[PDB]
Design a protein around this ligand. Structure first.
Ligand SMILES: Cn1nc(-c2cc3ccc(C#N)cc3[nH]2)nc1NC1CCN(C(=O)c2cccc(Nc3ncccn3)c2)CC1
Lengths: 116, 120
């Protein structure tokens, strides 16, 4: 079973993490936080990020994750009214780095599809 | 002269103040979406120092910081506590006071602290 890393680590994030648990071990002062998170990132097989909300922390985890050569899945909701960053959208190669647009209600159906 | 990379969230007057000061010390490289990404990565690889204004939350600024760390770049993150925001623990904890620095600043001292950083 794969070691999974979930970025930005409320009820929607808990839904993502519960579904992630069905496929593998979800591994997930300030210096200690960073060191602990980078050690988990380094040991992950799949890195999942919910990129709807602008976040320096989520972006930094993705940047380190690409440089660590991990398989990355980004989940974005266009119904939020936001336009996803050109840097995250442009990092997508449709294979080891995918950006999936989704609706709140299809988060379980999409994760099942990705992990099967 | 050295190559300098600047980034900030997509306010613009402050970024122009930072870039205008950066020009004194070197060439500011950064003054469909796949093409934006590749050009940014080439510029990141060419830079000797990466400067990010990290007051405004941004997935893009974060991602460029993540990629710069793995390219072993000299990084300066500028943060304004007077914005009322609390800087991300990830970016705060990424600093080591040497190759990756996170400096708090006030709007009025942006020219003086870039002088202190690049004159050292
Ligand atoms: C490379 N770079 N350069 C500067 C930079 C800021 C700045 C301010 C003042 C001056 C002066 N004088 C010069 C400046 N240069 N910011 C950056 N990176 C930022 C990283 C976060 N962003 C994103 O995630 C983002 C989000 C949505 C769309 C796009 N579209 C996009 N289109 C084309 C190119 C770049 N981006 C990007 C915005 C861009």
């Amino acid at each position: 079973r794969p070691a999974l890393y979930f970025c930005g680590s409320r009820t929607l994030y808990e839904r993502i993490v519960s579904r992630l648990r069905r496929f593998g071990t979800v591994l997930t002062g300030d210096r200690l936080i960073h060191e602990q998170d980078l050690e988990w990132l380094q040991q992950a097989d799949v890195v999942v990020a919910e990129v709807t909300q602008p976040s320096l922390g989520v972006g930094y985890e993705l940047g380190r994750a690409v440089a660590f050569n991990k398989r990355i899945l980004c989940l974005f909701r266009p119904q939020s009214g936001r336009v996803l960053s050109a840097m995250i959208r442009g990092a997508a190669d449709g294979s080891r780095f995918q950006v999936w647009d989704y609706e709140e209600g299809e988060v379980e159906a999409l994760l099942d599809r990705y992990f099967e």
